[PDB]
């Protein structure tokens, strides 16, 4: 049929270098700012604690660091959670269960891999029943190194995840479509 030529530009900036220069761009920036602000302000993980890393994960919630003061509530059901924290050695016996709990989280969902064991198989990397890193099983957004990561390192990893949320384009991305 009818449309036979194109006028699309040739140097349209990529999202990572795009700045909001128009009324609709500022509107969408504000809406994205609200949504990302909510996502960082209500940071709900699923606890999925497996080994010695779960102890530093509890000490995050202890009085001295008080994850709750930032808006972090650990919620038992995966249905009510945003973030999965893989804190511990992932065995071959546990891999299907982990993938199942990851699948049952509603979108949007993020995963943080805490500890050497979850990052790369760690001190049991050459064992016959250990998955050499949870990113064989679920996609991972932030890797927290340590064995076990101190509570401050885990909180720093949380801040990194929130920084990633804060730079996410939601409606601006739709506008680019």
């Amino acid at each position: 049929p009818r449309v036979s030529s194109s006028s699309m530009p040739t140097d349209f900036p990529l999202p990572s270098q795009q700045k909001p220069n128009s009324a609709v761009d500022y509107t969408l920036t504000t809406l994205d700012a609200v949504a990302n602000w909510a996502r960082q302000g209500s940071f709900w993980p699923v606890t999925f604690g497996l080994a010695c890393c779960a102890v530093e994960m509890m000490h995050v919630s202890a009085p001295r660091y008080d994850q709750d003061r930032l808006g972090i509530i650990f919620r038992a059901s995966p249905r009510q959670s945003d973030i999965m924290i893989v804190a511990g050695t992932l065995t071959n016996k546990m891999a299907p269960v982990l993938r199942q709990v990851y699948d049952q989280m509603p979108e949007p969902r993020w995963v943080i891999s805490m500890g050497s064991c979850a990052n790369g198989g760690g001190y049991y990397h050459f064992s016959y029943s250990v998955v050499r890193g949870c990113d064989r099983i679920v996609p991972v957004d932030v890797y927290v190194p340590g064995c076990p990561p101190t509570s401050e390192a885990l909180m720093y990893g949380v801040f990194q995840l929130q920084r990633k949320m804060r730079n996410t384009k939601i409606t601006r991305m739709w506008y680019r479509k």
Partner: protein
């Protein structure tokens, strides 16, 4: 039949090595994955096993 506590230890010995315990009421794997082939603590079993898993 003599010591109740020996139940789990004998299931572990079988799982790790393959040693059978005659008269054990419920002898099955206790540690290894379901459907694991091989008895890991045998000197001829390689360190890293023969198989690994991933998401397909």
């Amino acid at each position: 039949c003599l010591y109740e506590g020996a139940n789990w230890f004998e299931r572990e010995a079988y799982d790790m090595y393959g040693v059978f315990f005659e008269g054990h009421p419920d002898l099955r794997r206790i540690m290894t994955d379901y459907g694991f082939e091989g008895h890991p603590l045998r000197k001829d079993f390689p360190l890293t096993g023969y198989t690994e898993v991933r998401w397909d």
